[PDB]
């Protein structure tokens, strides 16, 4: 609980904008979310 509340108050301002970037109100945290721009619920494990 101590670690969860400090992680959320440090990370909660990160929000996906209209470019799929992650930013804090103007300021880039990621150029693309997850570096691939995908949702984690929409992934398939596939062999190359």
């Amino acid at each position: 609980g101590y670690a969860n509340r400090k992680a959320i108050f440090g990370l909660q301002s990160c929000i996906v904008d209209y470019y799929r970037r992650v930013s804090i109100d103007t300021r880039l945290v990621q150029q693309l979310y997850g570096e691939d721009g995908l949702d984690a619920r929409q992934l398939e494990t596939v062999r190359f």
Binding site: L11, C14, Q30
Partner: protein, 88 residues
């Protein structure tokens, strides 16, 4: 997400009160909500801090809702469609 946040400024910042100060210094309301409101509020007053409302805690401490999810994009009435298709 953790590493990109902690390394955003070119230095490794922490998930403590000190790290929040480095990344979001002007977000007093976020910073007040984390650990120590009285010290943060006192510093904000003498510094004349301007706090833009963004994220989750800053809207929440002001009684509003975050501009996130369903609230991210705003809806406007289709003025032209209604005139052609609807009646008073």
């Amino acid at each position: 997400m953790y590493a990109d946040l902690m390394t955003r400024t070119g230095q490794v910042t922490s998930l403590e009160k000190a790290g929040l100060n480095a990344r979001e210094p002007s977000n007093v309301l976020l910073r007040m909500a984390l650990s120590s409101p009285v010290q943060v509020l006192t510093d904000a007053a003498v510094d004349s801090a301007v706090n833009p409302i963004y994220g989750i805690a800053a809207p929440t401490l002001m009684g509003s809702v975050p501009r996130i999810g369903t609230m991210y994009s705003d809806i406007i009435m289709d003025e032209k469609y209604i005139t052609e298709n609807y009646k008073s």
